[PDB]
Amino acid sequence: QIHLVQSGTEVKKPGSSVTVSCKAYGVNTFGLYAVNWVRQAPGQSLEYIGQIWRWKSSASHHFRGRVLISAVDLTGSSPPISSLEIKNLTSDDTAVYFCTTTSTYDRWSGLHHDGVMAFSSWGQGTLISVSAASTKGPSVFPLAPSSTAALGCLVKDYFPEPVTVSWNSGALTSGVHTFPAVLQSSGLYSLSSVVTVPSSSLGTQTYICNVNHKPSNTKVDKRVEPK
Amino acid sequence: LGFLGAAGSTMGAASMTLTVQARNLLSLTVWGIKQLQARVLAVERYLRDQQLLGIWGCSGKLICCTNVPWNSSWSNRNLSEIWDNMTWLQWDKEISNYTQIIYGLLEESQNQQEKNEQDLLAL
Amino acid sequence: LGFLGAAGSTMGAASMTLTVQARNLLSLTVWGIKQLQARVLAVERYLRDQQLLGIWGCSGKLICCTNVPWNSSWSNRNLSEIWDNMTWLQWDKEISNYTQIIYGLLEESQNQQEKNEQDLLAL
Amino acid sequence: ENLWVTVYYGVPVWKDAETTLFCASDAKAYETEKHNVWATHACVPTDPNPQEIHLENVTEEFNMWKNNMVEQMHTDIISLWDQSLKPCVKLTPLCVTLQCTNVTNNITDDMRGELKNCSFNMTTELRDKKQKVYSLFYRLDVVQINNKEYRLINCNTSAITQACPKVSFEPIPIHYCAPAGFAILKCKDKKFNGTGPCPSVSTVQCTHGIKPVVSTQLLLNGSLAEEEVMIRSENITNNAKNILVQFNTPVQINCTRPNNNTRKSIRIGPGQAFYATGDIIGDIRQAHCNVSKATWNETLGKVVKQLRKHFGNNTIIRFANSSGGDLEVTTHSFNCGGEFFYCNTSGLFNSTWISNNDSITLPCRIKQIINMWQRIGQAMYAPPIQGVIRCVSNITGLILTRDGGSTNSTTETFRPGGGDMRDNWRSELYKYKVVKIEPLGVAPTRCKRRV
Amino acid sequence: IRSENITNNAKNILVQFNTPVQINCTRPNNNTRKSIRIGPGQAFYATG
Amino acid sequence: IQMTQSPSTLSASTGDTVRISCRASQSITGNWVAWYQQRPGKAPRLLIYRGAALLGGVPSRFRGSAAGTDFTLTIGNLQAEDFGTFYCQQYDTYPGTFGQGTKVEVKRTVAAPSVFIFPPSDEQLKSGTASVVCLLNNFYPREAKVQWKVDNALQSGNSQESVTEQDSKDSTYSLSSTLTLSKADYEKHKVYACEVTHQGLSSPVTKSFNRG
Ligand SMILES: *[C@@H]1O[C@H](CO)[C@@H](O[C@@H]2O[C@H](CO)[C@@H](O[C@@H]3O[C@H](CO[C@H]4O[C@H](CO[C@H]5O[C@H](CO)[C@@H](O)[C@H](O)[C@@H]5O[C@H]5O[C@H](CO)[C@@H](O)[C@H](O)[C@@H]5O)[C@@H](O)[C@H](O[C@H]5O[C@H](CO)[C@@H](O)[C@H](O)[C@@H]5O)[C@@H]4O)[C@@H](O)[C@H](O[C@H]4O[C@H](CO)[C@@H](O)[C@H](O)[C@@H]4O[C@H]4O[C@H](CO)[C@@H](O)[C@H](O)[C@@H]4O[C@H]4O[C@H](CO)[C@@H](O)[C@H](O)[C@@H]4O)[C@@H]3O)[C@H](O)[C@H]2NC(C)=O)[C@H](O)[C@H]1NC(C)=O
Ligand SMILES: *[C@@H]1O[C@H](CO)[C@@H](O[C@@H]2O[C@H](CO)[C@@H](O[C@@H]3O[C@H](CO[C@H]4O[C@H](CO)[C@@H](O)[C@H](O)[C@@H]4O)[C@@H](O)[C@H](O[C@H]4O[C@H](CO)[C@@H](O)[C@H](O)[C@@H]4O)[C@@H]3O)[C@H](O)[C@H]2NC(C)=O)[C@H](O)[C@H]1NC(C)=O
Ligand SMILES: COc1cnc(-n2cnc(C)n2)c2[nH]cc(C(=O)C(=O)N3CCN(C(=O)c4ccccc4)CC3)c12
Ligand SMILES: *[C@@H]1O[C@H](CO)[C@@H](O[C@@H]2O[C@H](CO)[C@@H](O)[C@H](O)[C@H]2NC(C)=O)[C@H](O)[C@H]1NC(C)=O
Ligand SMILES: *[C@@H]1O[C@H](CO)[C@@H](O[C@@H]2O[C@H](CO)[C@@H](O)[C@H](O)[C@H]2NC(C)=O)[C@H](O)[C@H]1NC(C)=O
Ligand SMILES: *[C@@H]1O[C@H](CO)[C@@H](O[C@@H]2O[C@H](CO)[C@@H](O)[C@H](O)[C@H]2NC(C)=O)[C@H](O)[C@H]1NC(C)=O
Ligand SMILES: *[C@@H]1O[C@H](CO)[C@@H](O[C@@H]2O[C@H](CO)[C@@H](O)[C@H](O)[C@H]2NC(C)=O)[C@H](O)[C@H]1NC(C)=O
Ligand SMILES: *[C@@H]1O[C@H](CO)[C@@H](O[C@@H]2O[C@H](CO)[C@@H](O)[C@H](O)[C@H]2NC(C)=O)[C@H](O)[C@H]1NC(C)=O
Ligand SMILES: *[C@@H]1O[C@H](CO)[C@@H](O[C@@H]2O[C@H](CO)[C@@H](O)[C@H](O)[C@H]2NC(C)=O)[C@H](O)[C@H]1NC(C)=O
Ligand SMILES: *[C@@H]1O[C@H](CO)[C@@H](O[C@@H]2O[C@H](CO)[C@@H](O)[C@H](O)[C@H]2NC(C)=O)[C@H](O)[C@H]1NC(C)=O
Ligand SMILES: *[C@@H]1O[C@H](CO)[C@@H](O[C@@H]2O[C@H](CO)[C@@H](O)[C@H](O)[C@H]2NC(C)=O)[C@H](O)[C@H]1NC(C)=O
Ligand SMILES: *[C@@H]1O[C@H](CO)[C@@H](O[C@@H]2O[C@H](CO)[C@@H](O)[C@H](O)[C@H]2NC(C)=O)[C@H](O)[C@H]1NC(C)=O
Ligand SMILES: *[C@@H]1O[C@H](CO)[C@@H](O[C@@H]2O[C@H](CO)[C@@H](O)[C@H](O)[C@H]2NC(C)=O)[C@H](O)[C@H]1NC(C)=O
Ligand SMILES: *[C@@H]1O[C@H](CO)[C@@H](O[C@@H]2O[C@H](CO)[C@@H](O)[C@H](O)[C@H]2NC(C)=O)[C@H](O)[C@H]1NC(C)=O
Ligand SMILES: *[C@@H]1O[C@H](CO)[C@@H](O)[C@H](O)[C@H]1NC(C)=O
Ligand SMILES: *[C@@H]1O[C@H](CO)[C@@H](O)[C@H](O)[C@H]1NC(C)=O
Ligand SMILES: *[C@@H]1O[C@H](CO)[C@@H](O)[C@H](O)[C@H]1NC(C)=O
Ligand SMILES: *[C@@H]1O[C@H](CO)[C@@H](O)[C@H](O)[C@H]1NC(C)=O
Ligand SMILES: *[C@@H]1O[C@H](CO)[C@@H](O)[C@H](O)[C@H]1NC(C)=O
Ligand SMILES: *[C@@H]1O[C@H](CO)[C@@H](O)[C@H](O)[C@H]1NC(C)=O
Ligand SMILES: *[C@@H]1O[C@H](CO)[C@@H](O)[C@H](O)[C@H]1NC(C)=O
Ligand SMILES: *[C@@H]1O[C@H](CO)[C@@H](O)[C@H](O)[C@H]1NC(C)=O
């Protein structure tokens, strides 16, 4: 019943420090388990950061002198909790950090090779977004059809994520293709959500897209008109 | 010194103290039943590797050199990082994939110089 | 192939597969009692021919050549009609009259080159 | 450049492996005898000086809660008690109705029936004739059915088997030895909590002496922590998990049965005697255990200091007496010289601790019909001891328990608790791991057998 | 067909089918076990 | 050491057998190699360790294999739950290293997209920007590039693309390309065109529009 649960998504200034946590439920002690911290870049392969194996912590060559791994044992009310602190964040430190755990009690296991382990239990993801600029409202622009077609809505210059798009108060769902957001060159985000509908019904039915934004608390509803 | 004393020593330093471990592997109420199955279980377990050590030709030896090469795909390490660097437990965990292969080569190569020496005895 | 697979083969063809048979001869309720006398009965029966095979000098061997001749009154057959013609069971049934004679010559002739080699070690 | 396989025999490598450990008892029959419920005669002689080898360079991993050395000692003692209770009297003829009367009545105290004087009918000698006998029973072993009539507490649910009066009940230290080809790894750490790596390991042929003394709420005559009080729980955040404390210094507990009893024989059949209690010679006093008030007070402040390492440096820790259950789980029950006491340990656990000579008398009471613990429809009658009982022992730990409510509350309550004698064996065998030695190895050496 | 002595009437004959014949059967009564105490710590499991 | 998986994309249909390959820089004779499966929006998942050892609970359909320098994974009798990145790890030397990924997709059949071009929104124009978009819908073999021809001139260095995940029902893709440019330059240009090249079309189809 091992269930590692970590902190939530956070956005940090480029130069501050972070501390990711990972509460290990179902892990009896950290002297019988090894906690390794691996990180997955937005589109790269997982990269190993550091570990605490026998109450002695270590970090890989890249992160030596720049990362901190700590862990506390089973104590009264909480489980064993391990936390990773990253100092001097850079633009390339934004990735889904993972908490891992391997059972080291067995000496003939093969999940671990005398210091190096295979990761048998994984956390869930603690995506860290290191970016500049302040939170910006989700300004919406229309993708008005012009000459079966497919229309949609455009949202850009909004930050941070996420934004949920619903059409006609979330009534129509078939044909909705909300493309994932793409980071711009000015430290912002943009996306396009479109729906495909029969041409004959363009003027008969009105289509409205709902632009929701949690961090800014700004909800914008817009109506699209075929051209 | 002592039974298993060279357990954390590198492979090379623990090969000088074999006779310490080798001379220790042999040595109707509820107590009598469990004291009688401890004796039986200790002669059948000791005779299991005496028979094995005999189909390989190393009958009365603690170190026996065999006529089968290492194949270098079982472990591609030096002869110095193996004998002074790795303990016996580490080496066993590393070479545990090919013991059942090395063990079967050790006896199929012994009943081949047992017929070659049997053929050579007639000449 | 397999334990006793070369049972119907002539004596010659079944001498290549000795290690198949030799490696298989060792391996408190009503079930527990009869499982415990199967283990005991199987280590003593294995030690009866290890001791016998040791007073003859063939301790860790599956084929051992001895220093006692055949006497030609035990079996006056060729060396070709015996090794490719007769299976091991047939040969045993034929030579069963002189096994207790051959067995006693095998150990009285081994503790005679054990004193001859003991006398030769002083010179 | 080319290498050859060479086999070594007697290479140091081992694996964890459960096997059948046996006995070594140093205290064989030292010309004194009096066979007990245990080793004595049947347990193999122990070495005059055991060998301990300190495995340097080696860091093993111990888990005190997945140990099979204690799941095997648990069944070695249930079956040592069975094999000693089969060859003696079965008290099935004593399911008659008893005409019990209070021994004191208008004699002393509040007319309490701590003792009853019960007369019943039994067939002495011939199976036709039955004469009227009598014996002294405790109020804990007679159930009123309705100078009213009583009956034994047990014999509507369990079958009584009088303990054979020649076997002794005094625990004798037992060494649990391992066959040849196996070894026991001892964690020589002084601050060991039964889980995690032990960087200072050792190899022993078999364990130290382990008295098979079973008790509840308090571990008597056990082994002490070398440095500090040690708290060990399977899951320290679970209320259903017991906590095993271990004292660095023993707390002496004296107690007595000051009544000069007298055993008398009743013939329940041909060649079968029931050993009842005839009378009491002298004043009728109450049993009780004594613990020093100051020594307990300071030893209980060492426990609360370590309990603060797992429950916050700033928290109020209070001990309370046991909530409910059998008389053996709610009271400190032990066996002092063949007599089973159930002491009221409510004056010990009556404290409350906030973050910055005199004696305590515990009124024990005696029971004569004893049920088996992990439960069976079976019981044992312990014949009376003729004389005055007086034994002194060491308290070397506690078996505590927590109660739910530590989610919003800023306080912890620690009721004592026992009743499972598997937690009696792992307060002694927590530091022992059995391993099996694998002596064959291969390795490239650049030898070559000469043809 | 296998018999010790196929010409002796006192010898049983053991037939062996090449294909099994299925035999279904039931005790369609919904019984109920009830406990009777025949002694201290001894129950007789009768039918209620 | 560094592992090198191949192929990076291994689209296959359900019910067949699949085979991922993983070649390490040097020989791993101890079989210190484990296989992880990641699904979209989830954490990795161990399948095989010690070369070809099945982790408890994993379906017996997976079957690893070790060959000193060439380690493999066989997803025999593929279901729909075995689609996602497959990672290669080696714990023979410090530090553990991962491969790069092997995306397993569905086969279905080749389809063709339906391009739709849109003009810079009039409301969006007042903001000072004249971004334009190209939108394909319901195509396959990805392998799609958008050619942005402004005034019959090639444009590059100002286009951003976004491709959605494979559809669960029709197993179809999508793609959108956007040109971010200053509002003033939008008026200067005369004609805007988007060109798309896909294997599912006989010839590159171009849909354009005129300013206004
Ligand atoms: C059963 O019995 C067992 C035996 O007794 C018992 O085991 C004991 O358990 C306790 C835990 O309960 C153990 O104590 C813990 O040990 C952890 C391990 O710490 C090790 O590593 C750190 C870090 O070392 C790196 O850095 C230093 C330099 O700073 C280097 O020198 C190191 O080599 C190493 O550097 C490498 O790695 C770096 C990456 O980390 C690289 O960057 C670098 O380049 C290198 O590659 C060391 O500091 C520790 O040394 C300390 O102890 C030794 C010996 O005592 C001293 O000599 C030394 O001077 C140090 O004092 C050690 O080596 C600790 O991390 C852990 O600490 C946490 O808890 C304690 C209190 O419990 C705090 O004081 C501490 O600050 C940590 O708290 C933080 O973390 C927790 C958990 O995440 C958070 O919840 C908490 O809020 C807090 O967060 C805060 O701090 C963060 C910084 O860490 C910060 O970022 C946050 O934002 C926030 O502000 C603790 O001390 C003990 O060792 C065991 N005993 C034994 C013998 O093993 C077991 O518990 C028992 N069972 C039960 C059930 O009880
Ligand atoms: C915790 O551990 C301590 C010490 O290990 C135990 O203390 C022992 O308690 C038992 C039971 O009371 C004692 O045994 C009894 O001793 C009585 C008095 O002891 C005298 O005799 C002995 C032996 O000659 C002398 O060494 C001693 O100095 C005294 O002179 C005896 O009268 C008892 O005899 C009765 O029982 C025996 C055996 O059943 C019969 O053979 C007799 O005929 C008679 O019926 C009995 O021998 C023992 O002496 C104590 N030892 C010590 C060192 O004090 C605790 O009992 C133990 N606690 C628990 C809970 O386990
Ligand atoms: C007394 O309990 C039995 C009663 N009766 C039998 N049997 C009756 N007939 C047969 C064949 N067995 C028993 N067998 C094994 C028994 C046990 O081991 C057993 O449960 N404990 C022995 C140790 N201990 C005590 O000292 C004790 C200690 C502190 C307080 C109270 C009692 C606990 C319980 C057993
Ligand atoms: C020890 O007990 C605690 C309960 O006090 C267990 O912790 C729970 O674990 C489950 C399993 O995922 C979680 O869902 C709960 O949220 C946890 N609750 C608390 C309060 O921690 C823990 O798993 C137990 N330890 C072991 C090894 O089983
Ligand atoms: C328990 O009751 C019995 C009666 O059954 C008492 O025995 C009697 O005691 C008186 C006074 O000692 C004698 O005069 C009688 O002869 C006794 N009768 C028998 C049948 O023995 C016995 O004394 C009582 N014991 C206690 C401790 O109260
Ligand atoms: C023991 O048995 C005797 C009889 O053998 C019981 O004494 C009888 O009690 C009844 C009560 O109704 C009287 O009617 C009889 O006259 C009595 N017979 C006598 C005194 O000889 C006695 O009660 C029994 N005691 C028990 C069961 O404890
Ligand atoms: C109770 O504990 C005391 C320790 O305070 C025990 O006495 C010690 O016994 C050990 C050996 O058993 C000696 O090495 C110490 O020198 C003794 N110390 C003192 C102060 O006597 C005593 O034996 C214990 N009694 C038991 C366990 O019944
Ligand atoms: C317990 O009572 C018995 C009586 O049954 C006492 O034994 C008597 O002791 C006195 C002097 O000690 C002797 O004169 C008697 O002859 C003894 N009688 C018997 C039957 O033995 C015993 O001493 C008492 N024990 C204690 C501790 O007071
Ligand atoms: C328990 O009994 C022991 C003796 O069996 C007591 O030890 C005595 O303690 C006093 C202190 O007042 C010393 O003067 C004596 O020399 C001690 N006697 C022995 C034999 O050591 C101990 O005090 C008692 N403890 C309790 C709590 O009753
Ligand atoms: C533990 O101590 C408490 C109080 O010290 C006892 O609580 C009593 O419980 C009974 C129920 O049987 C109530 O009738 C009383 O009113 C309670 N007393 C108080 C003061 O609240 C409890 O009985 C004790 N239990 C044990 C096992 O010692
Ligand atoms: C054990 O001792 C405690 C206290 O010494 C007893 O607690 C008493 O419980 C009754 C009712 O349960 C209360 O009326 C008393 O006031 C309590 N006494 C004290 C001092 O608080 C307890 O009854 C004794 N026995 C058991 C079985 O717990
Ligand atoms: C636990 O200790 C407290 C105090 O240490 C005891 O409180 C007693 O409360 C009664 C209330 O009627 C007072 O009459 C007593 O004087 C108090 N005791 C003292 C020493 O002042 C409480 O009784 C104790 N409980 C148990 C079960 O022992
Ligand atoms: C046999 O009889 C028992 C009754 O003893 C049936 O058990 C009852 O089943 C009904 C519905 O199936 C429940 O509503 C009752 O609560 C059950 N009673 C008990 C005591 O279990 C049982 O279903 C019957 N079996 C068959 C095959 O008819
Ligand atoms: C090397 O050996 C290990 C164990 O000696 C192998 O691991 C086993 O793999 C099988 C394959 O399904 C599993 O069923 C076993 O559960 C694994 N071991 C254990 C202890 O469970 C490993 O596969 C071997 N390496 C290779 C490449 O085959
Ligand atoms: C060496 O090992 C390989 C690995 O399986 C094997 O294929 C080969 O037959 C072995 N023998 C030689 C001579 O390489
Ligand atoms: C193996 O031994 C040679 C002998 O000098 C040495 O040069 C080489 O570095 C060694 N290899 C390793 C991996 O240590
Ligand atoms: C039995 O006879 C057949 C036919 O000649 C022969 O091929 C076979 O080898 C014989 N048995 C054995 C064990 O070879
Ligand atoms: C024995 O072998 C010789 C060798 O040629 C042969 O001539 C002779 O016939 C053989 N004898 C028998 C009985 O086969
Ligand atoms: C244990 O490790 C230390 C580390 O230097 C070493 O000196 C020592 O020799 C090792 N133990 C043995 C038995 O060699
Ligand atoms: C014994 O004392 C108890 C105390 O309450 C009382 O209930 C009972 O009736 C008494 N029995 C006799 C026979 O006096
Ligand atoms: C002694 O007991 C009192 C209460 O009885 C407590 O307050 C005090 O802390 C205790 N002293 C020590 C040293 O534990
Ligand atoms: C003591 O209090 C501190 C609070 O700073 C806490 O961290 C620690 O765990 C507590 N226990 C100790 C230091 O043994």
Breaks in chain D after residues, C-to-N cutoff 2.5 Å: 146, 356
Strands D52-53 and D60-63: unpaired
Give CA–CA dist D123/D130, Å, rounded.
4
Q: How far apart are CA D264 and CA D277, in angstroms?
A: 6
Expressed as residue numbers, the domain containing B66 is 4-121
CB pairs under 8 A between B and F: 12
CB contact (8 A) between residue B5 and residue D21: no
Q: Are C52 and C64 in contact (CB under 8 A)?
A: no
What six digits make up the tokens of A55? 């109450």
Domains defined along chain F, listed by start: 1-107 (2.60.40.10), 108-212 (2.60.40.10)
State the Cα–Cα distance between residues D94 and D368, nearest whole angstrom: 14
Closest residue to F34, CB basis, from A118, A179, A180: A118
Contact A107, A186 (CB under 8 A): no
Written as six digits, the tokens of D411 are 């306080």
The rounded distance, in Å, linking the Cα atoms of D345 and D333 is 10
Q: How many domains does chain C have?
A: 1
Chain B residues closer than 8 Å to C49 by CB: none
Question: Which amino acid would we find at residue A28?
Answer: N
Taken in order D297, D303, D308, D311, is the CA torsion positive or negative?
negative
**Which chains share 3+ C-beta pairs under 8 angstroms with D?**
A, B, E
Q: Which residue, A211, D13, D370, is CA-closest to B99?
A: D13
SS (H, E, C) D175-235: EEECCCCEEEEEECCCCCCCEEEECCEEEECECCCECCCCCCCCCECCCCCCCCCEEEECC
Give the H/E segment covering residue B92: helix B88-95
Quote the tokens at residue D356.
Answer: 């910055």
The reply to whether ligand 17 has any atom less than 6 angstroms from the CB of C66 is: no
Pick from C74, C79, C68: nearest CA to C96: C74
Architecture of domain A3-127: Sandwich (2.60)
- Largest Cα separation within chain B, whole Å, is 62
Q: How far apart are CA D357 and CA B81, in angstroms?
A: 68
- Compute the nearest-CA separation of E42 from chain D (Å): 8
**Which residues on adjacent β-strands are paired with residue D25?**
D45
Atom of ligand 4 nearest to the CA of A27: 27
User: Any idea how long chain D is?
Assistant: 451
Q: A27 CB contacts (<8 Å, ≥6 apart)? A: A2, A4, A33, A79, A80, A101
Both tokens assigned to B11: 């492979």
**How long is chain C?**
123
Indicate whether residue D351 lines ligand 12 (CB < 6 A): no
Q: What tokens were used for A10? A: 């956070």
**Best mutation site among B72, B81, B91, B97 for testing chain F: the one with the most F CBs within 10 Å?**
B97
A201 SS3 class: helix
- Side-chain-side CA neighbours of D254 within 13 Å: the count stands at 7
The alpha-helical segments, DSSP class H, found in D37-144 are 70-85
Question: Bridge partners of D389?
Answer: D257
DSSP D368-379: SEEE-SS--SEE
What sign has the CA pseudo-torsion A178, A180, A185, A189? positive
Contact F115, F205 (CB under 8 A): yes
Ligand 22: does its nearest atom lie under 6 Å from the Cβ of D191?
A: no
Distance (Å) from CA B77 to ligand 16 centroid: 9
Paired tokens of D37: 């419920």
- Residues of F near B (CB-CB distance < 8 A)? 27, 29-31, 51, 68
Bridge pairing between strands D359-362 and D366-367: unpaired
Tokens representing residue C111 in the block: 């503790």
Span D9-448 CATH architecture: Beta Complex (2.170)
Q: What ranges do the domains of chain D cover?
A: 9-448
CB atoms within 10 A of CB D33: 12
Among all ligands shown, which has an atom nearest to the Cα of D35? 2
CA-wise closest residue to F86 among F14, F18, F167, F185: F18
Structure tokens at A192: 């396009």
**Are the C-beta atoms of A195 and A176 separated by less than 8 Å?**
yes
Whether residue B46 contacts residue D180, with contact meaning beta carbons closer than 8 Å, is answered with yes
Q: Which atom of ligand 13 is nearest to the CA of E32?
A: 5
Torsion region of A170: left, alpha or beta (phi above 0 gives left; psi -120 to 50 gives alpha): left
CA–CA gap between residue A221 and residue A208 (Å, rounded):
7
Q: Quick check: helix, strand or coil at residue C64?
A: coil
How many degrees, rounded to 5, is the angle at CA D297 between CA D294 and CA D302? Answer: 130
Q: Which 3 state secondary structure label does DSSP give B121?
A: coil
Rg from Cα positions in chain E = 23
Contact A196, A175 (CB under 8 A): yes
- Which residue from D minimizes the CA distance to B58? D7
Q: Which helix (H) or strand (E) holds A156?
A: strand A149-158
Give the CA-trace dihedral at A21, A24, A29, A31, to 10 degrees.
-50
Give the helix ranges, DSSP H, for D54-173: 70-85
Residue of B nearest to A106 (CA): B93
CA–CA–CA angle A42, A46, A51 (5° rounding)? 125
Contact indicator for B22, D439 with CB cutoff of 8 Å: yes
- Which atom number of ligand 10 is nearest to the Cα of residue D350? 5
Q: Which residues are CB-neighbours of C38 under 8 A, at least 6 positions away? A: none
Give E31's contacts (C-beta < 8 A, 6+ positions apart).
Answer: E47
C-alpha neighbours within 13 Å on the C-beta side of residue B108: 6
Q: Residue F122: which of A146, A141, A209 has the closest Cα? A: A141
Residue pair F196/F134 in contact (Cβ under 8 Å)? The answer is yes
Asked whether A117 and A111 are in contact (CB, 8 A), the reply is yes
